[PDB]
RNA sequence: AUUAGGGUUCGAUUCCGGAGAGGGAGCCUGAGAAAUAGCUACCACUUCUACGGAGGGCAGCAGGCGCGCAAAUUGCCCAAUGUCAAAACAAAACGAUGAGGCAGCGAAAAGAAAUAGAGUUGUUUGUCAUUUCAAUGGGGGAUAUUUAAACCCAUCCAAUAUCGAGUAACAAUUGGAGGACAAGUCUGGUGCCAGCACCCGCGGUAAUUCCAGCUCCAAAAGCGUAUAUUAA
C-alpha cells in the first residue's frame, strides 16, 4: 500500500527548522484603514486598461 | 485665553413646592461652578442655600443626588428645606440624617438577628435569651 | 431575570463577504471619511434603509391618509432638521434618493473638518476624542454626533479644553513641573 | 343549528355547520359541531328541521342548551 | 396541476402533509430514526476513550493513509472512528484517554476521501488538539 | 429569529394562566389548601442515638456529588419596590423579608469607542530617514460626588496650593493567498508518502493546495470550528 501507521510525522520532520526574522510593529485602528488608503488611492495612480497587480513577487525559475 | 480667577459657585432652583405635610419646602437645585477643581461639596451647598432662602440655621436644610453634568461645570440634585430643625430631626431618614450628622447608631449584622430567631424558636419560654 | 431595558443592534454585515467593488468603495469611504472600521459604514447603512422602508410604505398610501399625512410629514421634519435633506426639496420622494455620504456628511468628524476647525477628518476625529469642541456649549467626546443645522453655528472649542477659555493642557502642565522640581 | 338526531327522550342533537378559513391556503373548508340539546314537549321537532336553542345551566353531562323554536 | 377551488383548502392541507415527507431534509428533521442512528444523540460534541489506533486507505484517485483511531463514547459506548485534524497528531494521542470529538463538517456525512469516517478528534486530555499540535501547550502525563 | 410578499421556525425561561414539591394516596384547621420550609400512612432512599428510641424532603437563595458538549458567590442590605402585620414618623421607642434591590464571577448577546494628531530639511506628488510641536485617555489620586454603606460611572489635576505617553514596548489577534472568494512566476523538503482539501481538487523529484519567512488579503477586540435553525 506503500504507507503505514509508522510514517506518521514524516514531513513534519523532514522540514527543517527556520526561525522568523525580526519586525517592528504597525499602525492599529484607524491608522492601519487611512495607512493603507493611501497606498491604495494615493501613494500611486489608476491608468486605464491596466489592472493594479495587489502582491507582485520577484521573478524566479 | 485664560485667567486666573477666583472659585465661584451660582446656585438655581427649578420647581419650588410647598407643602405642609412634612413642614418643608423643596425644589431641585442646579449648580454653576465654572472654575472649581473637582466637584462641590454639598456642605458648601448648604450655606449658600441657607443664605439664598434666609433659612436661621444651615442644618435644617436636607441636599441630596447631586448628579454633576457631563463636560463639567455644572452639577444638579434635589434638595428639601424645613420650616424648623426640629421637624427636620422628626422627619428625615437615618442615612440622611447620618450624613448631617444626626443619624441613630449602626443596628448589629442582620445574620446574627436572622440567626437568634431561630435558636429562641428552638427553646421554651424563658429559656430564651436570658 | 426580571431585567427590562431593550439591546437593539444597529449593523448588519454584507451578503458577500468579498465583492472587490464593494471592498474598495468602502476603502475609499474610509480614508475620506476617517473611520476606524467597516461597522461605522454599515451603521450608516442600517441608518438609511430604515428610513427608505418607511418611506416606501408611505408613498403606496394616498397623499390624504392620515397615517401618511402624519408619519410623512414627520420623517420630512427629521431629514431636514438634520440637513439630510435640502429645505425646497419638499416632496416625499426626496427621501427615498438619500444617500451613504450625506449621513456622513452631517457627523461631526466630518462638520469639525469641513469648518475650518480641523485640517484634517483625521484630525477632527482625535480633536473630538480629547474633548475639545463643544456644541451648544455642550461637550462632545463621539465623533459620530449627527448634527443639526440649527446648532451648526455653535460649534466651537469647548470653554475648558485648552485651545481657547481653558487651563493649559497637559505638555504645557507636565514639563511645568519637571522645572519647578529641577530646582 | 338544525336537528340532527331525535332519537333520545326530550333532547336532541344539532348540528352547526360553517366554514372554517385557512390563511395560508386562503381557502374555507366545511366543519361541523354537534350539540346536545333539551328538547320541551312544546316542540316536536323533525329530523332535518330548524332550531334556535339558548344557553342554561348545565343539564346533564352534556346539555347546556334548550330550544327555544322549531322552524 | 393542482385543486383551485375557494372551499378547498382541506384537499390542499393535505397534499402538503402527504408530500413534506418526501423531503429528505424535512423527513429526517421530524423523525427519530436519524437521532437514535447518531452517535452523538442530537449534539454538536461528544467525549470518549481511545481503543486502538487504524490507518485508513484513502479513495481513489488520492492514495494515502490517514490516521484515524476507535473511540468508544462515555454517554452511549458505541464504536466510532475518528480523524485527527494535522499531521504528527497520532503520536500525540494515546490508548485509553479522554478525547472530546465533533462532526467532520457535513452534518453526519463523511467527508474528503476518508471512506467511513463522520467525526473528528478535537481535544485530547481537556487540551485541544490544535495547541498541542501547534507546539502551544503540552499535555499532561 | 428570519423574511419583498406569502411564509418557515423557536417559545423550559422574567408578564399572564395551569401544575408539582422524591413517588402515590388521605386529612385537620381555616373564608380560602387535598397545603407539603402542615399532619397521617405505604414504597424507595436516607441521619442521630445512651439501641429504649427519635428524625428528612433545596424543581427557594447561597453552595456540594454525579450527569453531561454544557451553565456564577455559602457576598452586602431592607436604602428603593412591594408583602404581611396589633402597625405613619419621631421620642429608653430603629418590625420581618435569600421576595427584592445593590456588588463579585460572567468574550451568551447588545450600544459608544483606544492603539495616536500635525509639521521644517533631505531623500507635482507620494515612501523613507530627521528635527520637533502641542493633546487626550488608560492609569495615580482627591475639597470631595455617587451610594443604606460601598464599588462603578460623572468632576478636577488647585480655587493661594493637586501626577503622569515616544520604540507614545501603555508592543492586535484569527483564518487564508488555484476556483467558488479578497490576496504571491518567493518558498524548501517529501515524491500519490507526510499531509491539505466543507465542494472541485493538490501531492508519483522544478507541489498551484503539504509542512515555514516576507508580503498581501479579509474581519477586527474580536476571529475560527461543530451541531441545530431561518434565508438562499
Ligand atoms: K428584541
Ligand atoms: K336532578
Ligand atoms: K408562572
Ligand atoms: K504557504
Ligand atoms: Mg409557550
Ligand atoms: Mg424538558
Ligand atoms: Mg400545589
Ligand atoms: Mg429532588
Ligand atoms: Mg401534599
Ligand atoms: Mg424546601
Ligand atoms: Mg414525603
Ligand atoms: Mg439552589
Ligand atoms: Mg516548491
Ligand atoms: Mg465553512
Ligand atoms: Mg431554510
Ligand atoms: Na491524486
Ligand atoms: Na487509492
Sequence with gaps: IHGSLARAGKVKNQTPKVAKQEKPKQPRGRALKRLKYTRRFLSKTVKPGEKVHMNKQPPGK | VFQKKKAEVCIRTSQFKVNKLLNRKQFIVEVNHPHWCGTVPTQLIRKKLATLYKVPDASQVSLFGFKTKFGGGKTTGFGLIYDDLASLKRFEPNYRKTRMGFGKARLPARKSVKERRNRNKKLRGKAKGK | ?183 | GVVHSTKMHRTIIIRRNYLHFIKKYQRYQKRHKSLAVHCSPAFDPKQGDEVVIGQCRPLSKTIRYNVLEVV | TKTNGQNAARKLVRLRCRNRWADKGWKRAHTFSARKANPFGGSSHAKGIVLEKIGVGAKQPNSAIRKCVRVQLIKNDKKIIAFVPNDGCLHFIEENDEVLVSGFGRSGHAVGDIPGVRFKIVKVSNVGLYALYRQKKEKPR
Design chain 3, 1 to 183: 431575570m426580571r431585567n427590562y431595558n431593550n439591546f437593539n443592534r444597529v449593523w448588519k454585515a454584507p451578503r458577500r463577504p468579498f465583492e472587490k467593488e464593494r471592498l474598495d468603495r468602502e476603502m475609499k469611504l474610509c480614508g475620506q471619511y476617517g473611520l476606524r472600521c467597516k461597522r461605522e459604514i454599515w451603521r450608516v447603512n442600517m441608518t438609511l434603509s430604515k428610513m427608505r422602508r418607511t418611506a416606501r410604505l408611505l408613498l403606496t398610501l394616498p397623499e390624504n391618509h392620515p397615517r401618511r399625512l402624519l408619519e410623512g410629514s414627520a420623517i420630512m421634519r427629521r431629514c431636514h432638521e438634520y440637513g439630510f435633506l435640502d429645505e425646497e426639496k419638499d416632496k416625499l420622494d426626496y427621501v427615498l434618493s438619500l444617500t451613504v455620504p450625506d449621513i456622513l456628511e452631517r457627523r461631526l468628524q466630518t462638520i469639525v473638518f469641513k469648518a475650518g476647525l480641523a485640517k484634517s477628518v483625521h484630525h477632527a476625529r482625535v480633536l473630538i476624542q480629547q474633548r475639545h469642541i463643544a456644541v451648544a456649549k455642550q461637550i462632545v467626546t463621539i465623533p459620530s454626533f449627527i448634527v443639526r443645522v440649527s446648532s451648526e453655528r455653535h460649534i466651537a472649542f469647548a470653554d475648558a479644553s485648552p485651545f481657547g477659555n481653558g487651563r493649559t493642557g497637559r505638555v504645557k502642565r507636565v514639563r511645568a513641573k519637571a522645572a519647578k522640581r529641577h530646582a
